[PDB]
């Protein structure tokens, strides 16, 4: 002998929510700008030699 059991309407499961994400783009390396170092080096010598 067993106890009776009637299955009711199923209870609500927790809802899943998708998400679409687009990644950021990496930074770009700064191109190599360059100073005319030798020019200012001759300068302080000339003004000094005077």
């Amino acid at each position: 002998m067993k106890r009776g059991f009637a299955r009711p309407t199923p209870e609500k499961p927790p809802v899943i929510k998708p998400e679409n994400i687009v990644l950021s783009t990496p930074l770009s390396i700064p191109p190599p700008e360059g100073k005319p170092w030798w020019l200012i080096v001759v300068g302080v010598v000339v003004v000094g030699l005077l």
Partner: protein, 50 residues
């Protein structure tokens, strides 16, 4: 040259012999800056970028 000439006319005669190396080296340094030198942004192909 006027500065050297002015001192010579005054009679100091300090630039005689090796003393003359000071005016000589200076005149060379000035020449390097005014004739070759370096260009601005209008001359993009500076040696380090090319």
């Amino acid at each position: 040259g006027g500065m050297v000439a002015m001192v010579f006319a005054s009679g100091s005669h300090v630039f005689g012999g090796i003393g003359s190396i000071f005016p000589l080296f200076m005149m060379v340094g000035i020449m390097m800056m005014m004739f070759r030198g370096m260009g601005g942004g209008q001359q993009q192909m500076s040696r380090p970028k090319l």
